[PDB]
């Protein structure tokens, strides 16, 4: 398992996902693209999407935060933690 999540300090949609991921006790690896544009633009190569947040789990992309919420609550996120 390798949960990654792109975040930005000045981005509340980013921090939204952290209330979820903390509620679910998830072992994410947070990528602040506030003080960074390198790994930011590495994200843009990972998925083609420019915006944050974006979650990746074992190099498979999710989508946005609402996408993750549904992907969690449906049980797509949860069993990949194993
Ligand atoms: S909170 C920072 C910005 N987020 C969004 O705009 C999210 C948009 C959704 N993906 C959508 O539904 O379209 C952000 O990431 N801006 C990037 C930028 O171009 O500055």
PDB file of C-alpha atoms and ligand atoms in Angstrom:
ATOM      1  CA  UNK A   1       0.000   0.000   0.000  1.00  0.00           C
ATOM      2  CA  UNK A   2       1.239   3.502  -0.931  1.00  0.00           C
ATOM      3  CA  UNK A   3      -1.401   6.200  -0.484  1.00  0.00           C
ATOM      4  CA  UNK A   4      -0.145   9.611  -1.718  1.00  0.00           C
ATOM      5  CA  UNK A   5      -2.137  12.883  -1.652  1.00  0.00           C
ATOM      6  CA  UNK A   6      -1.253  16.226  -3.191  1.00  0.00           C
ATOM      7  CA  UNK A   7      -2.133  19.197  -0.995  1.00  0.00           C
ATOM      8  CA  UNK A   8      -1.585  22.966  -0.961  1.00  0.00           C
ATOM      9  CA  UNK A   9      -1.507  25.104   2.189  1.00  0.00           C
ATOM     10  CA  UNK A  10      -3.663  27.758   0.494  1.00  0.00           C
ATOM     11  CA  UNK A  11      -6.317  25.299  -0.813  1.00  0.00           C
ATOM     12  CA  UNK A  12      -9.274  24.285   1.419  1.00  0.00           C
ATOM     13  CA  UNK A  13     -10.288  21.465  -0.990  1.00  0.00           C
ATOM     14  CA  UNK A  14      -6.877  19.984  -0.039  1.00  0.00           C
ATOM     15  CA  UNK A  15      -7.579  20.240   3.714  1.00  0.00           C
ATOM     16  CA  UNK A  16     -11.105  18.775   3.184  1.00  0.00           C
ATOM     17  CA  UNK A  17      -9.438  15.526   2.064  1.00  0.00           C
ATOM     18  CA  UNK A  18      -7.374  15.489   5.280  1.00  0.00           C
ATOM     19  CA  UNK A  19     -10.468  15.468   7.490  1.00  0.00           C
ATOM     20  CA  UNK A  20     -11.562  12.407   5.470  1.00  0.00           C
ATOM     21  CA  UNK A  21      -8.191  10.669   5.458  1.00  0.00           C
ATOM     22  CA  UNK A  22      -7.798  11.361   9.203  1.00  0.00           C
ATOM     23  CA  UNK A  23     -11.397  10.221   9.936  1.00  0.00           C
ATOM     24  CA  UNK A  24     -10.515   6.954   8.087  1.00  0.00           C
ATOM     25  CA  UNK A  25      -7.084   6.786   9.893  1.00  0.00           C
ATOM     26  CA  UNK A  26      -5.350   6.459   6.503  1.00  0.00           C
ATOM     27  CA  UNK A  27      -1.575   6.126   6.067  1.00  0.00           C
ATOM     28  CA  UNK A  28      -1.267   8.817   3.360  1.00  0.00           C
ATOM     29  CA  UNK A  29       1.952  10.561   2.258  1.00  0.00           C
ATOM     30  CA  UNK A  30       1.130  14.258   1.893  1.00  0.00           C
ATOM     31  CA  UNK A  31       2.748  16.292  -0.957  1.00  0.00           C
ATOM     32  CA  UNK A  32       2.543  20.072  -0.224  1.00  0.00           C
ATOM     33  CA  UNK A  33       2.682  21.862  -3.615  1.00  0.00           C
ATOM     34  CA  UNK A  34       2.446  25.177  -1.837  1.00  0.00           C
ATOM     35  CA  UNK A  35       6.245  25.590  -1.354  1.00  0.00           C
ATOM     36  CA  UNK A  36       6.911  23.325  -4.402  1.00  0.00           C
ATOM     37  CA  UNK A  37       6.351  23.208  -8.187  1.00  0.00           C
ATOM     38  CA  UNK A  38       8.686  20.285  -9.140  1.00  0.00           C
ATOM     39  CA  UNK A  39       6.702  17.408  -7.539  1.00  0.00           C
ATOM     40  CA  UNK A  40       3.605  19.476  -8.383  1.00  0.00           C
ATOM     41  CA  UNK A  41       4.349  19.214 -12.098  1.00  0.00           C
ATOM     42  CA  UNK A  42       5.370  15.560 -11.575  1.00  0.00           C
ATOM     43  CA  UNK A  43       1.640  15.086 -10.540  1.00  0.00           C
ATOM     44  CA  UNK A  44       0.605  16.693 -13.847  1.00  0.00           C
ATOM     45  CA  UNK A  45       2.630  13.930 -15.595  1.00  0.00           C
ATOM     46  CA  UNK A  46       1.146  11.227 -13.281  1.00  0.00           C
ATOM     47  CA  UNK A  47      -2.529  11.933 -14.153  1.00  0.00           C
ATOM     48  CA  UNK A  48      -2.635  14.787 -16.716  1.00  0.00           C
ATOM     49  CA  UNK A  49      -4.670  16.860 -14.174  1.00  0.00           C
ATOM     50  CA  UNK A  50      -3.272  20.189 -12.956  1.00  0.00           C
ATOM     51  CA  UNK A  51      -5.412  20.837  -9.846  1.00  0.00           C
ATOM     52  CA  UNK A  52      -5.176  19.620  -6.213  1.00  0.00           C
ATOM     53  CA  UNK A  53      -6.004  17.612  -4.229  1.00  0.00           C
ATOM     54  CA  UNK A  54      -5.351  14.403  -6.137  1.00  0.00           C
ATOM     55  CA  UNK A  55      -4.925  11.040  -4.456  1.00  0.00           C
ATOM     56  CA  UNK A  56      -2.876   8.172  -5.833  1.00  0.00           C
ATOM     57  CA  UNK A  57      -2.906   4.668  -4.304  1.00  0.00           C
ATOM     58  CA  UNK A  58      -0.196   2.263  -5.508  1.00  0.00           C
ATOM     59  CA  UNK A  59       0.427   4.640  -8.458  1.00  0.00           C
ATOM     60  CA  UNK A  60      -3.219   4.357  -9.615  1.00  0.00           C
ATOM     61  CA  UNK A  61      -4.875   7.777  -9.618  1.00  0.00           C
ATOM     62  CA  UNK A  62      -8.220   8.498  -7.936  1.00  0.00           C
ATOM     63  CA  UNK A  63      -9.409  11.965  -8.979  1.00  0.00           C
ATOM     64  CA  UNK A  64     -10.474  14.870  -6.723  1.00  0.00           C
ATOM     65  CA  UNK A  65     -11.633  14.902  -3.078  1.00  0.00           C
ATOM     66  CA  UNK A  66     -15.366  14.282  -3.644  1.00  0.00           C
ATOM     67  CA  UNK A  67     -14.155  11.480  -5.931  1.00  0.00           C
ATOM     68  CA  UNK A  68     -12.072  10.082  -3.023  1.00  0.00           C
ATOM     69  CA  UNK A  69     -15.014  10.376  -0.549  1.00  0.00           C
ATOM     70  CA  UNK A  70     -17.211   8.246  -2.812  1.00  0.00           C
ATOM     71  CA  UNK A  71     -14.232   5.976  -3.663  1.00  0.00           C
ATOM     72  CA  UNK A  72     -13.689   5.500   0.108  1.00  0.00           C
ATOM     73  CA  UNK A  73     -17.315   5.052   1.152  1.00  0.00           C
ATOM     74  CA  UNK A  74     -17.952   2.545  -1.693  1.00  0.00           C
ATOM     75  CA  UNK A  75     -14.989   0.477  -0.406  1.00  0.00           C
ATOM     76  CA  UNK A  76     -12.532   1.152  -3.278  1.00  0.00           C
ATOM     77  CA  UNK A  77     -10.008   3.064  -1.092  1.00  0.00           C
ATOM     78  CA  UNK A  78     -10.299   0.887   2.004  1.00  0.00           C
ATOM     79  CA  UNK A  79      -9.205  -2.607   0.722  1.00  0.00           C
ATOM     80  CA  UNK A  80      -6.090  -1.111  -1.009  1.00  0.00           C
ATOM     81  CA  UNK A  81      -4.792  -0.188   2.467  1.00  0.00           C
ATOM     82  CA  UNK A  82      -4.031  -3.953   2.631  1.00  0.00           C
TER      83      UNK A  82
HETATM   84  S1  LIG B   1      -7.782  24.522  -3.861  1.00  0.00           S
HETATM   85  C1  LIG B   1      -6.647  24.783  -5.255  1.00  0.00           C
HETATM   86  C2  LIG B   1      -7.248  24.614  -6.658  1.00  0.00           C
HETATM   87  N1  LIG B   1      -8.211  23.517  -6.671  1.00  0.00           N
HETATM   88  C3  LIG B   1      -9.166  23.429  -7.595  1.00  0.00           C
HETATM   89  O1  LIG B   1      -9.375  24.334  -8.403  1.00  0.00           O
HETATM   90  C4  LIG B   1      -9.933  22.109  -7.682  1.00  0.00           C
HETATM   91  C5  LIG B   1     -10.814  22.031  -8.940  1.00  0.00           C
HETATM   92  C6  LIG B   1     -11.361  20.627  -9.218  1.00  0.00           C
HETATM   93  N2  LIG B   1     -10.364  19.723  -9.795  1.00  0.00           N
HETATM   94  C7  LIG B   1     -12.484  20.691 -10.234  1.00  0.00           C
HETATM   95  O2  LIG B   1     -13.566  20.164  -9.930  1.00  0.00           O
HETATM   96  O3  LIG B   1     -12.228  21.166 -11.358  1.00  0.00           O
HETATM   97  C8  LIG B   1      -6.154  24.208  -7.640  1.00  0.00           C
HETATM   98  O4  LIG B   1      -5.672  23.078  -7.543  1.00  0.00           O
HETATM   99  N3  LIG B   1      -5.754  25.043  -8.591  1.00  0.00           N
HETATM  100  C9  LIG B   1      -4.670  24.681  -9.493  1.00  0.00           C
HETATM  101  C10 LIG B   1      -4.283  25.872 -10.311  1.00  0.00           C
HETATM  102  O5  LIG B   1      -4.475  25.819 -11.541  1.00  0.00           O
HETATM  103  O6  LIG B   1      -3.835  26.866  -9.709  1.00  0.00           O
END
